[PDB]
Amino acid sequence: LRPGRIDRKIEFPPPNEEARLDILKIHSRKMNLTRGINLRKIAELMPGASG
Amino acid sequence: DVLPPEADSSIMMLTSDQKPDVMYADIGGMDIQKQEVREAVELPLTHFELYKQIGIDPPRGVLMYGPPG
Amino acid sequence: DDEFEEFPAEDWAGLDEDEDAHVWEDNWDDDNVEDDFSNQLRAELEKHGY
Amino acid sequence: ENLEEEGLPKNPDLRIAQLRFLLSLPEHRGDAAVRDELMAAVRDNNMAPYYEALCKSLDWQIDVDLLNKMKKANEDELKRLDEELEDAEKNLGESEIRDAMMAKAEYLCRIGDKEGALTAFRKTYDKTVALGHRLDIVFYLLRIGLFYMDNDLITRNTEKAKSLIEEGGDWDRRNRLKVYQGLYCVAIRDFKQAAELFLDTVSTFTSYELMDYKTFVTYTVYVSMIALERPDLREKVIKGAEILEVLHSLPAVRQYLFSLYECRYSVFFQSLAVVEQEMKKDWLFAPHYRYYVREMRIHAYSQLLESYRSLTLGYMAEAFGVGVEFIDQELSRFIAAGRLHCKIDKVNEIVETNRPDSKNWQYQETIKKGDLLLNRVQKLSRVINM
Amino acid sequence: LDKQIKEIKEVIELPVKHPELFEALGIAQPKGVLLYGPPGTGKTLLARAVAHHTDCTFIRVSGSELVQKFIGEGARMVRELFVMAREHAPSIIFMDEID
Ligand SMILES: Nc1ncnc2c1ncn2[C@@H]1O[C@H](COP(=O)(O)OP(=O)(O)OP(=O)(O)O)[C@@H](O)[C@H]1O
Numbered sequence A: 001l002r003p004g005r006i007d008r009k010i011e012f013p014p015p016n017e018e019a020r021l022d023i024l025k026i027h028s029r030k031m032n033l034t035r036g037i038n039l040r041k042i043a044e045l046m047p048g049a050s051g
Numbered sequence B: 001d002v003l004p005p006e007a008d009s010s011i012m013m014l015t016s017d018q019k020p021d022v023m024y025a026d027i028g029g030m031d032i033q034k035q036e037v038r039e040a041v042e043l044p045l046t047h048f049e050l051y052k053q054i055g056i057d058p059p060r061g062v063l064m065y066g067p068p069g
Numbered sequence C: 001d002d003e004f005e006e007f008p009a010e011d012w013a014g015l016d017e018d019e020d021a022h023v024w025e026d027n028w029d030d031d032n033v034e035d036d037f038s039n040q041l042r043a044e045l046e047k048h049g050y
Numbered sequence D: 001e002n003l004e005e006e007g008l009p010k011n012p013d014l015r016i017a018q019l020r021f022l023l024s025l026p027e028h029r030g031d032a033a034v035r036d037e038l039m040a041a042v043r044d045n046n047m048a049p050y051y052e053a054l055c056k057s058l059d060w061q062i063d064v065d066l067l068n069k070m071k072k073a074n075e076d077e078l079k080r081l082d083e084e085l086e087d088a089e090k091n092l093g094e095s096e097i098r099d100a101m102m103a104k105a106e107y108l109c110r111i112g113d114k115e116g117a118l119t120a121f122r123k124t125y126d127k128t129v130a131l132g133h134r135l136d137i138v139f140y141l142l143r144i145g146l147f148y149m150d151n152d153l154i155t156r157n158t159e160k161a162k163s164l165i166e167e168g169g170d171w172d173r174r175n176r177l178k179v180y181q182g183l184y185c186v187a188i189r190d191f192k193q194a195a196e197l198f199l200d201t202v203s204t205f206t207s208y209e210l211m212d213y214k215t216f217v218t219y220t221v222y223v224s225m226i227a228l229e230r231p232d233l234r235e236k237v238i239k240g241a242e243i244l245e246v247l248h249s250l251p252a253v254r255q256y257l258f259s260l261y262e263c264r265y266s267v268f269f270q271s272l273a274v275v276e277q278e279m280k281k282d283w284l285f286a287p288h289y290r291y292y293v294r295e296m297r298i299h300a301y302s303q304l305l306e307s308y309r310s311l312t313l314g315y316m317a318e319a320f321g322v323g324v325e326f327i328d329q330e331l332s333r334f335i336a337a338g339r340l341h342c343k344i345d346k347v348n349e350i351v352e353t354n355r356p357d358s359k360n361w362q363y364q365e366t367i368k369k370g371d372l373l374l375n376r377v378q379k380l381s382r383v384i385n386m
Numbered sequence E: 001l002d003k004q005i006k007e008i009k010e011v012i013e014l015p016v017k018h019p020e021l022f023e024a025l026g027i028a029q030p031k032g033v034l035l036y037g038p039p040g041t042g043k044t045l046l047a048r049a050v051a052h053h054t055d056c057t058f059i060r061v062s063g064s065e066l067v068q069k070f071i072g073e074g075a076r077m078v079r080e081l082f083v084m085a086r087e088h089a090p091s092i093i094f095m096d097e098i099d
């Protein structure tokens, strides 16, 4: 943690609703999905979830 | 020469007589473990096309772990 | 090559605007001259007084 | 409600191709509404090369002021994209470089600059790292090919997309590729494969950049009634939940399908005339509207003759709501073509059905296709010798 | 993770592709990056992606003995891995703390 050793520290917070929706869109793309899946609702159904 | 692939094996497959007598009904109360093993071992063997159609990648291996006995 | 300039090359005068440019199992029956089936059915619907 | 937002980018807008085809038709050349919509799309997208092609092929009067304004807008936007690419290659990273080229290629495709769009898309693909981005570029090329009906482009990009989807297990892209392939098979009279792909993607359709879902279901039904057997049509289309749900809003298509399935042959013939007038105006079904309809007629005739040993000509005419002479001519034409397994006793006006073995029908196709392949082999050897 | 993508880009992509930017700025090019967050948030995913897009060799240092034979028969110091990394420069040495 001394300055100059790590030139940049980047935080990876757990995804919010929109980031969870993006991750859901990325990972459900590998599946035979019926048309009209409300991935937004499923993202809202996963509070405090990781990728 | 090239030997047949099934030949030259110090380890043999289980014959009919070597099959254990333990049934699924003999095992009591491991429905979760039975379901996971079936979905990861015995179902992909017979339903690999279904796994491909759905988009699931069948697990190559299964690690069964827990306390002894 | 010994191209056949002896024979009179009739002028092309064709349509270079992709007249057909298709790859099917095309058959002669599509080229039968006739009005559309809609016109035939319309002309025979009233032939019975309907 | 977010259906259309799910689809791929609408470049090129296939509605533009449909309207251009409509204007190519002699019946609808002077339609003011079609011309107005096409001109509105051209003006909004500033399609200078497409405007040139439109006025050249259709022999229109080029609005000099409009053309100059659209060309100036195109030049300024191209200069801006070139500046963005130049900034990216010196300061930003490879991802931003690829983004700048993707913007340039998208603009070139949007304005109808087909060759420049292809060149820019090839350049962008050459240094695109993400597999899905490469597959999106391939879908862009497929859409461009469908826009101009470029068979070579469509086939090459379909093979490339199949390979890319095999590499990365993207089932969504697989469904989109199935939809595109079904559209192409419709374009090239391959109704069996088109029906198969459409039925596979009837419950996963998201390609709203190609067509509306209602239009997709209508196309699926149209190809299914010509490419499917009666049990397959019953199981997949007649009892299909999604297809029936869509057909609830399409009374004409449901009537057309069920009249054939329920053997309401006069209703089926009327719906077939309506469907024919629909196909004539569709740029995908226009080359085959004469073929498709004829085949459908044969199907109807075959169906009416499938279960009966013999049928009087009057009964056939009454069932189809046409004259006896019309039935005579149609049946004679289709029997002479070898498509109907029956013979007409015109003396008593009785159509007697036949049951020719599948061996003869396999042998005739074997002769035909073997002769085609033999001609290919002969001409290939002819090329080889000299 | 667009913000994280940009942040890791400015530190790992720019020094490899454009050292002249840092030389003109008169600052030392970054050499160490920390990615901190709950498990499963994409730290390894973003590290692998940034190694993949910049054509930088991605080396994962788990400290496992199973791979030690590949690192070197000595194995007395972890810096013995550097000989491999220098052979595949540009390189990204990645280590994930399980904790
Ligand atoms: N669910 C169960 N129902 C009935 N018997 C059980 C059950 N689970 C374990 N047993 C008993 O466990 C005994 C043998 O243990 P088992 O070999 O299955 O354990 P293990 O997990 O393989 O053990 P270890 O880790 O020591 O190898 C059998 O005699 C069997 O009766």
Ligand SMILES: Nc1ncnc2c1ncn2[C@@H]1O[C@H](COP(=O)(O)OP(=O)(O)O)[C@@H](O)[C@H]1O
Binding pocket: A015, A023, A026, A050, A051, E001, E038, E039, E040, E041, E042, E043, E044, E045, E046, E096
């Ligand atoms: N933000 C994200 N977007 C997409 N996928 C993610 C994201 N975060 C995690 N994943 C998925 O989770 C899996 C494991 O995550 P990983 O990156 O190993 O977590 P960590 O950041 O703790 O190392 C990866 O295969 C990745 O596909």
Ligand SMILES: [Mg+2]
Binding pocket: E039, E040, E041, E043, E044, E096
């Ligand atoms: Mg992790």
